């Protein structure tokens, strides 16, 4: 500072260096913030049951996208970060986890509102499930359901059984391909949680208090 020179300049690097970094960054906000949020919140929004690829499909694209922002996949060798890069590792995780959360709050939210078939709306694959109509009479000298209720529920559990197969075998950021760059084991975790095991004794009660 004493002939007033060379601190402006290293001052004027620093910034350039920030100025790079901040750029760096405004790109990971881009990049990240948003196309895969939206994409989470289609996943979260796509009712599994009946609605009147393409995400998957996404998610394999933003996978590939992010690595196109110089990410560390693998540590860096002569930094050797091997600490630091599962961090960002394990947030993917948490997001992927919410991925996964998404599909499993959808799919919770309709085996809570099965009761309610004639409100909402089936998709082509699901055309003979909708507020099903089923023939009665004298089955036997006895009123019953002509196709045997417990019959329908398993064609209401086969529904749910395509759904839940077609869930389960999924191409998300981690299953990128057949499950190649990670397992489909939360798929098969989520099958036995709560909101599909527990379920199933919360559907086949209000199915025998409608036989009730």
């Not at 002509?146 to 998300?172: D, G, M």
């Amino acid at each position: 500072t004493w002939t007033s020179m060379n601190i402006e300049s290293y001052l004027y690097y620093v910034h350039q260096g920030l100025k790079k970094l901040e750029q760096l960054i405004i790109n990971v906000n881009d990049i990240i913030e948003n196309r895969i949020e939206n994409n989470l919140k289609t996943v979260s929004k796509v009712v599994l049951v009946h609605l009147p690829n393409v995400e998957v499909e996404r998610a394999v694209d933003d996978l590939l996208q992010t690595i196109m922002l110089y990410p560390l996949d693998p540590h860096v060798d002569p930094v050797l970060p091997e600490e630091t890069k599962r961090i960002k590792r394990y947030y993917f995780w948490y997001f992927y986890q919410a991925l996964l959360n998404s599909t499993q709050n959808s799919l919770n939210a309709m085996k809570y509102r099965v009761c309610g078939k004639k409100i909402p709306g089936a998709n082509t694959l699901q055309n003979l499930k909708p507020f099903f109509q089923v023939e009665v009479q004298l089955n036997g000298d006895k009123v019953t359901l002509n196709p045997s209720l417990q019959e329908i529920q398993k064609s209401i559990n086969r529904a749910a059984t395509a759904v839940l197969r077609c869930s389960k075998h999924l191409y998300n950021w981690d299953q990128q391909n057949k499950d190649s760059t990670d397992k489909a084991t939360f798929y098969d975790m989520i099958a036995c949680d709560k909101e599909i095991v527990k379920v199933i004794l919360l559907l086949t009660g209000s199915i025998q208090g409608t036989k009730n």
